Amino acid sequence: RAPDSVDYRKKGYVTPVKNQGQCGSCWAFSSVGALEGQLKKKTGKLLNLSPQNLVDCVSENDGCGGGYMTNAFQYVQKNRGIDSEDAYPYVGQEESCMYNPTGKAAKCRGYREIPEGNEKALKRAVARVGPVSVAIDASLTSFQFYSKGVYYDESCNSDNLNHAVLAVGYGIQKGNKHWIIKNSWGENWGNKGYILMARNKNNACGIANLASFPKM
Numbered sequence: 001r002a003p004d005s006v007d008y009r010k011k012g013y014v015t016p017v018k019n020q021g022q023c024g025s026c027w028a029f030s031s032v033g034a035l036e037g038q039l040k041k042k043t044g045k046l047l048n049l050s051p052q053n054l055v056d057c058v059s060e061n062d063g064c065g066g067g068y069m070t071n072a073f074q075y076v077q078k079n080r081g082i083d084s085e086d087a088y089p090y091v092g093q094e095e096s097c098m099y100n101p102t103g104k105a106a107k108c109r110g111y112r113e114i115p116e117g118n119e120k121a122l123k124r125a126v127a128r129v130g131p132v133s134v135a136i137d138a139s140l141t142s143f144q145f146y147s148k149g150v151y152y153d154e155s156c157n158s159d160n161l162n163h164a165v166l167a168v169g170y171g172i173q174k175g176n177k178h179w180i181i182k183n184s185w186g187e188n189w190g191n192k193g194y195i196l197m198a199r200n201k202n203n204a205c206g207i208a209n210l211a212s213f214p215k216m
């Protein structure tokens with residue numbers, strides 16, 4: 001039976017919360033979080049991978065003007081690697097590609113998409129695989145103003161995805177089922193950079209509409 005709750009933060013699969021700053025790089029933070037999870041599972045090592053590597057080098061994406069996580073995973077597979085943050089640090093602006101194979105810290109052998117809208121399939125992937133990259137509607141002030149408890153707003157638009165984040169678990173709080181979401185807006189946002197978002201409530205904020213994970 002799939003567990004009632006999963007929390008990758010408790011098992012050492014999740015790096016500290018980052019700040020994307022004034023750059024449309026949410027997709028790169030989402031991507032590296034899912035890669036970091038699979039790298040720890042596979043090799044036993046938790047380390048920061050380079051979102052700047054993805055911003056500068058994923059030519060199917062638009063760098064600081066936005067991207068998709070599936071394009072990030074495809075790049076790491078075709079490039080035969082991604083650098084560590086230490087080798088290729090985040091500066092929050094586009095520059096020409098500085099990928100160096102000597103800084104290589106992970107590889108990718110493809111990716112898988114969660115069937116669109118299917119919150120049970122997303123739950124099974126989080127339980128069996130690890131942290132999963134997800135897209136949400138994060139446009140409401142209620143989301144901006146989150147501090148505690150399970151986030152639900154009937155005005156969230158499941159059809160208008162505009163933010164990429166990382167699902168690092170799920171569970172239930174005082175009878176409210178939730179997703180555990182890592183954001184890239186710094187530790188001073190939300191609950192130390194995290195938000196619990198309503199689970200099995202009409203696919204709230206589109207959480208299962210564009211979910212994916214890398215294969216290693």
Ligand SMILES: CC(C)C[C@H](NC(=O)c1ccc(-c2csc(N3CCN(C)CC3)n2)c(F)c1)C(=O)N1C[C@@H](N)[C@H]2OC[C@H](O)[C@H]21
Pocket residue numbers: 020023024025026027059060061062065066067068069134135136161162163164210
């Ligand atoms: C998973 C999704 C929802 C994430 C979303 N993704 C896109 O919005 C997106 C935008 C652009 C392209 C693209 C790829 S190639 C190209 N262009 C090439 C030629 N030039 C001429 C035009 C642009 N554009 C893309 F793939 C995707 C995103 O990153 N966003 C949404 C924005 N609100 C930003 O805020 C949060 C995040 O920091 C940014």
Ligand SMILES: NC(=O)CN(CC(=O)O)CC(=O)O
Pocket residue numbers: 003004005006007008010011
């Ligand atoms: N059945 C379990 O141990 C599930 N765990 C979480 C996990 O395994 O990620 C529950 C908890 O830590 O409260």
